[model samples]
Target chain A: MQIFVKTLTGKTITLEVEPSDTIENVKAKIQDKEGIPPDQQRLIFAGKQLEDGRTLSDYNIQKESTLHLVLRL
Target chain B: LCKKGCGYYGNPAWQGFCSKCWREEYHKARQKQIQEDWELAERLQREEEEAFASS
Candidate 1:
């Protein structure tokens, strides 16, 4: 599935990953892309934290869905 | 209009102005700088992440 992550600055990044990808993998990807430490990063979708063990399916995210990332600070 | 002998009007030095006007102007200027910083940080972070993810 393809997911687009948009930042607070209005920048959008799209990634294609398998449905089996865990929330942890997405977190790692975001950290790797954004240079924010995993501990400091919080992935929020629909006003909920994407927990470490959760999958995209757990959030009911479908193909070509977009997720937003806003800096906590 | 007040003539030379007219009484003075009472207006406080700091009172009764549009708060939204001030705030909007303030945020207008502030948002410019904030937007610039946000974009810079966002671009750098995105490039870094893409590189790391690819590797």
Candidate 2:
């Protein structure tokens, strides 16, 4: 499924993922796209943190779901 | 009716399309300067206070 991730700055990017993709894998792409290290980003959905080892389906993610990126100082 | 390719480059929130360059760049420019400003203030307070103590 494809999802949208938005930054606090309102920059938006789309990610293509399979049901089997790990949250860590998604973060890697976000790091690459946003030029932010994975260590600097915390991905959240439905007010819950996404665990690195967990799969997208684990969080019950759905199509067009929006993800938020919080940056570390 | 925010269309992606139709010049509404900004995202939707509360049923509105915010202006494309709405402070994203403004804050971007301000960030670097604000930190610099803070550092300058800290230095001024610290070094100037040292002189104040001597006088």
Candidate 3:
């Protein structure tokens, strides 16, 4: 499955991952691609935290979907 | 005494493409510099006050 990551500066990056990947795994992938620290990375879905340890399927995330990443200081 | 590509070429002189890009980069660099300067100023002010109190 592929997911899109958008930066606070409006930059977009696409990452390919498996559907079985957990939220923590996804966070690591985003941190690597966007150069954002894990703690500083904010994963907001539908304007709320997706929380850690939840699977992608738990949040109804489909393949090729886009996730917004807001980097907060 | 005449040049077709003089003054401004790619875009208008007032809206020159080169100048536009240059201005954008300049603005970005300026903002970055201002942020760094503010941090440095704050540090210096704190250090100076500390030194004065220690005297």
lDDT of 3 by residue, A1-73 (tens): 7877655455677988776778788888888876777776666443345677887777766665556665443
Model 1 C-alpha lDDT per residue in residues A13-62, reported as the tens digit of each score: 67777777898888788777777666755555544556889899888666
Candidate 2 pairs with clashing backbones:
none
For model 3, residues B1-55, the per-residue Cα lDDT tens digits are: 1123344444455344455565565567545643453444345446556767788
TM-score to native of every candidate shown? 0.51, 0.55, 0.52
**TM per candidate, chain B:** 0.42, 0.54, 0.61
Clashes of each: 2, 0, 0
Q: Which candidate, 2 or 3, has the higher TM-score?
A: 2
The fnat of each candidate, in order, is 0.03, 0.00, 0.00
List the pairs of residues colliding in candidate 3: none
Ranking by DockQ: 1, 2, 3
- Give each prediction's DockQ, rounded to 2 decimals: 0.03, 0.03, 0.02
- Across B1-55, the per-residue lDDT of candidate 2 in tens digits comes to 3343345555565134345444454456545543443444345445546766777
**Could you tell me the lDDT of residue A49 within candidate 3?**
55
Clashes of 1: 2
Candidate 1 Cα outliers beyond 4 Å, as residue runs: B1-55
Model 3, residue A16: what's the lDDT? 85
User: Which tens-of-lDDT digit does each residue in A24-70 have in candidate 2?
Assistant: 89989887777888886677665466799998888767676667666
True contacts kept of 1: 0.03
Cα lDDT over the full model 1: 0.62
In the order shown, the candidates' Cα RMSDs to the true structure are: 14.5, 13.3, 14.2
